Design a protein around this ligand. Structure first.
Ligand SMILES: *[C@@H]1O[C@H](CO)[C@@H](O)[C@H](O)[C@H]1NC(C)=O
Ligand SMILES: *[C@@H]1O[C@H](CO)[C@@H](O)[C@H](O)[C@H]1NC(C)=O
Ligand SMILES: *[C@@H]1O[C@H](CO)[C@@H](O)[C@H](O)[C@H]1NC(C)=O
Ligand SMILES: *[C@@H]1O[C@H](CO)[C@@H](O)[C@H](O)[C@H]1NC(C)=O
Ligand SMILES: *[C@@H]1O[C@H](CO)[C@@H](O)[C@H](O)[C@H]1NC(C)=O
Ligand SMILES: *[C@@H]1O[C@H](CO)[C@@H](O)[C@H](O)[C@H]1NC(C)=O
Ligand SMILES: *[C@@H]1O[C@H](CO)[C@@H](O)[C@H](O)[C@H]1NC(C)=O
Ligand SMILES: *[C@@H]1O[C@H](CO)[C@@H](O)[C@H](O)[C@H]1NC(C)=O
Ligand SMILES: *[C@@H]1O[C@H](CO)[C@@H](O)[C@H](O)[C@H]1NC(C)=O
Ligand SMILES: *[C@@H]1O[C@H](CO)[C@@H](O)[C@H](O)[C@H]1NC(C)=O
Lengths: 573, 573
């Protein structure tokens, strides 16, 4: 059995008022064996799913019929529950697109002069999502022309005219258009009137009226617009620059509206916009800081772990502003416990148990978003198995030496190792040591130590035993060590290595120069074996040169043990 | 399913002629799942087990009833067969004990002198096992007295008298006794006559007549007897010594028969025995060579191995004479093959396959005996499984750096790795490579490399896929390295470390001294952080002493990457 891992997460749904169907489907599907029970949260609490009600679970999908803004707008969160564990899905926002009408009362006309700029505030109503604004010169559908004299704001909707003349007299009206996922809605305002006086025949300095704000909190990958429209006679050129840097040249325009389509982290900084004509200039500044969603850097994965082991899980996320990772067991938040410790970051287990098995979730959150990561912790109880890594079945041992017999079975938790020789239980003494990781240390080994070494590994699930046959032979001992000597260039030198060993076994002689071995397969070679017998292993250097000096080690070994002695040969004084 | 491992091997049975029952049980039992079919070999060929015949399988045991020496004296060798493999047991000798009668014809009398020693050969018949010999002075049942004047040999049975006198006249007869596992048999010889002349009143030098042989090939743990009886007037003292060593003092006797109960390898050498009286001495020599059975030093074990892997199994035996080690597959002997190498020793597989699964046996054989060791080789075909070692899930990468993504699944044999990005299969080029162990190496990494990398592992059992989501972030770069400086004792020194990183992540600064870290938790400590900001990580050494000189490394890291710069601070000129 394995826990629920999601393949369909719920998406945030903008439901239009001009909809084609009357149902909202929020999707949730998670792979588990057995298939999981799905429960939904509405605003944190557990919402009820009786038959005959307006909330229907079709398998894992939630279908809401008859939705309204006053009932069903908000937080939807799916939960998949197994007997292994319970996982919590991603945040779904069901949000309702609305567009209120304008005020139907009388609005005052605006008086101005010919040749000066005029403002006309739109006063737009409450809305979701962001409106696209237009203005009119006459009735519907006669729009304003989109020239360089009249400007409709994309942020506040207000109409700004840099210079009025005799052709601007008409019936003004604001207009708004909401573009949604399934429909498009358009409203228009109450009608306005502009009254104009006689012409002031002067040229004057500009002043910036339509202003982009002081801090624009951008996000990565989304289009950012800024406005710097101004008054003027004549019409002023608009210049954009960066105060603490330089602009990228793919989108530099001489326009009152600056639209940046792909915002990355080089777009963060201080911006200055400028209206300039032949009577002078005006500048105003602002800032764009570029913020980011959380993405994961490293996550947690499905861990089979033993009972009682230490375990560290790391889960880290990147984002500007920098996220607080918060942890979950089975849908409820995991605090610091008796064995489970959250550092709001990496999660440690001191001594695991069977209560700590389940689905664990890593939540990364800031004010730009919240992401989730799931992992199954399977804390396993295991019997001691000597099939994979047993006690050594045949243990050769040197007479008078010291051997190490490990008993390390595959066990969860750490098994009690009780050693025995035949039917006699081995205790610590001054000669035989039972170390509690499993190893048996036998020093000063004689002929009474041969036999039946049986390890009993025991924990609360079960018991097992393993058997090592131990036989004690004589050790390999060098009887004549080689002697260090200094020679000249081209002399003969013979080094002795006599060994003694148990005559059941087979002794061989390796000779090494600075712990690197000596080739003897060259015909006419300069290294020769001398007095080749069972116990005599002598080495002759013939015609010695400058590369033949160093430390020669005679290593007389059998297949179960070894002995080594050293000598130093120098070839030049 | 697992192979047959023996728990009952057959033992060599000496069957008596004076038997209590008429059946021979030779035992064979091997643990296997399913339980094994047992076939016996007798003298190498397969022996037929029809109902109504005189050879009955009671499960695994062989019962031979009505046994005779002319039919059933021979070797028996058990075989356990399952569909995994076939194992061959240790050889059991069924050998029949027999004791023939003496010759019933007339034997000649022996004439000698009074005071001189006499020999009387027994001429014993054919026998198994070794007989214990006695002689007589008259008819049955009075024996010879066991004094120092008359000696019965344990090797040839011949009676030797060192000095004859007037009380030795009688009816002599040899006698032999066989001690066996279920009965004891005794025979006695044809009657003899010793004729004696007048007494020679002289004292003379001894001469050794009953001689221990020149080479006595002993074994370990076996009692060895030697004889050095001699003639003489008076009765000579017998001395034993070692020529190439010294005797152990636990068994030194002044006796004509030297019996050593426990023979080890210090008993091997040259021996001299001596008969001495007041008219002189005599010495003769021999040799005892201590030999051994094969014992194993290192055996083979039950191995699950992949298809196509190299595999070396060592198998080694100790014993004098030194054992030739032979290998078996399934009852037939394994020579060198197209993929299987036997070097009469270690066994090498170059590329394994499904034909090479089965039970493999290791035989050690010399002329003192043969021993066996069995191991299952399970050559396994495996599908690619990414549950234990996947392609890593959420990959970070530096912008313009270098990554390696391993696709190493658990697969038997080595799976073909086909990498992909989305739906398009990655080829070698000059920017991205696919190494054939599974490693996708990407250099010069930009924003077009961000996405979904799927490894396909394919072999002839099956296919699997794994998926790594890779995001490309800007690397940690040190914008201003620390500078090396020379200071005096007690000066302040400030080292700068300015770094730059992608601001989606978080940056930390580790400061190390000769790649060992710097403690900052001391109040009033001599190492201080300076200008603690997001990107500025400076270090001030205050009141510098002689232990503060070395190489300081500033390692500015995030959690997915790092950058390091070095400086050298010395405190004394
Ligand atoms: C759920 O939350 C949203 C805003 O958080 C709220 O508008 C809505 O009325 C809430 N619904 C219920 C049933 O509490
Ligand atoms: C507004 O009036 C001035 C003066 O008559 C003229 O030069 C200008 O072109 C007019 N603008 C438009 C858009 O007609
Ligand atoms: C046996 O000896 C070792 C070595 O001192 C010690 O660590 C261990 O605790 C002892 N075992 C028991 C059961 O006391
Ligand atoms: C050792 O293990 C085997 C396998 O279960 C069991 O049959 C046997 O009784 C054990 N021996 C002891 C002494 O517990
Ligand atoms: C080694 O010794 C022999 C006799 O001492 C001598 O003839 C021979 O030349 C020597 N070898 C070399 C390489 O000098
Ligand atoms: C089997 O072998 C033994 C000696 O190797 C021999 O005495 C016996 O007659 C043989 N039996 C048969 C049936 O060949
Ligand atoms: C054999 O004869 C001699 C001489 O009469 C005597 O000294 C000796 O004791 C005799 N031996 C025995 C065993 O009676
Ligand atoms: C792709 O490139 C690596 C690196 O040179 C090389 O080892 C490998 O054989 C190439 N793959 C193929 C299918 O040729
Ligand atoms: C990847 O593996 C799954 C598991 O068998 C399989 O259903 C799927 O079709 C595979 N995809 C490709 C592209 O081979
Ligand atoms: C470090 O610098 C300040 C100002 O230069 C000085 O007053 C102080 O004594 C210095 N520290 C030591 C330990 O000399």
């Amino acid at each position: 059995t394995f826990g629920p891992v999601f393949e369909d997460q719920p998406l945030s749904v903008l439901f239009p008022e001009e909809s084609t169907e009357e149902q909202v489907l929020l999707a949730c599907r998670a792979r588990a064996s057995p298939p999981a029970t799905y429960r939904w949260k509405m605003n944190g609490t557990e919402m009820k799913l009786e038959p005959g009600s307006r909330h229907q679970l079709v398998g894992g999908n939630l279908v809401i019929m008859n939705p309204t803004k006053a009932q069903d707008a908000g937080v939807y969160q799916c939960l998949a529950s197994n007997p292994v564990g319970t996982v919590v899905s991603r945040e779904a926002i069901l949000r309702f697109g609305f567009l209120q009408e304008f005020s139907k009362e009388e609005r005052d006309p605006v008086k101005a002069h010919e040749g000066w700029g005029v403002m006309l505030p739109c006063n737009p109503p409450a809305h979701y999502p962001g409106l696209s604004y237009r203005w009119l010169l006459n009735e519907f559908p006669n729009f304003i022309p989109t020239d360089g004299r009249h400007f409709v704001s994309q942020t506040t909707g207000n109409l700004y005219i840099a210079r009025t003349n005799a052709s601007d007299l008409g019936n003004y009206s604001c207009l708004a258009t909401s573009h949604m996922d399934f429909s498009t809605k358009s409203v228009f305002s109450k009608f306005a009137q502009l009254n104009l006086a006689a012409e002031d025949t002067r040229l004057f300095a500009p002043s910036i009226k339509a202003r982009f704000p002081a801090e624009t909190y951008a996000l990565v990958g989304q289009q950012v617009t800024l406005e710097c429209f101004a008054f003027g006679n004549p019409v002023p050129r608009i210049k954009w620059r960066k105060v603490d840097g330089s602009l990228s040249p793919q989108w530099t325009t001489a326009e009152p509206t600056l639209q940046i389509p792909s915002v990355s982290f080089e777009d963060e900084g201080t911006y200055e916009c400028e209206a300039e004509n032949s009577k002078g200039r005006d500048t105003v500044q602002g800032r764009i800081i570029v913020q980011a969603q959380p993405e994961w850097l490293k996550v947690i994965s499905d861990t089979e772990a033993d009972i009682g082991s230490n375990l560290r899980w790391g889960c880290a996320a990147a984002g500007k502003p920098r996220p607080t990772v918060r942890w979950l067991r089975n849908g409820e938040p995991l605090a610091s416990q008796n064995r489970v410790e959250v550092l709001a970051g990496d999660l440690r287990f001191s001594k695991l148990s069977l209560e700590d098995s389940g689905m664990y979730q890593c939540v990364a959150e800031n004010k730009h978003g919240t992401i989730y990561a799931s992992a199954e912790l399977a804390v396993q109880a295991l019997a001691p198995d000597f099939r994979l890594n047993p006690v050594r079945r045949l243990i050769p041992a040197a007479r008078g030496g010291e051997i190490l017999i490990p008993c390390q079975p595959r066990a969860a938790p750490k098994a009690v190792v009780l050693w025995s020789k035949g039917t006699e239980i081995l205790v610590n003494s001054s000669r035989v040591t039972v170390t509690p990781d499993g190893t048996l240390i036998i020093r000063n080994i004689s002929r009474s130590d041969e036999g039946k070494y049986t390890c009993f590994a025991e924990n609360f699930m079960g018991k097992a035993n393993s058997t090592g046959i131990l036989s004690v032979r004589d050790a390999t001992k060098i009887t004549l060590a080689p002697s260090s000597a200094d020679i000249n260039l081209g002399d003969n030198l013979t080094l002795q290595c006599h060994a003694s060993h148990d005559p059941t076994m087979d002794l061989t002689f390796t000779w090494t120069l600075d712990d690197f071995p000596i080739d003897f397969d060259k015909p006419g070679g300069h290294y020769r074996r001398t007095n080749v017998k069972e116990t005599i292993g002598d080495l002759t250097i013939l015609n010695a040169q400058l590369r033949h000096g160093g430390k020669y080690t005679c290593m007389a070994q059998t297949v179960v043990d070894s002995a080594s002695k050293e000598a130093t040969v120098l070839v030049r004084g």
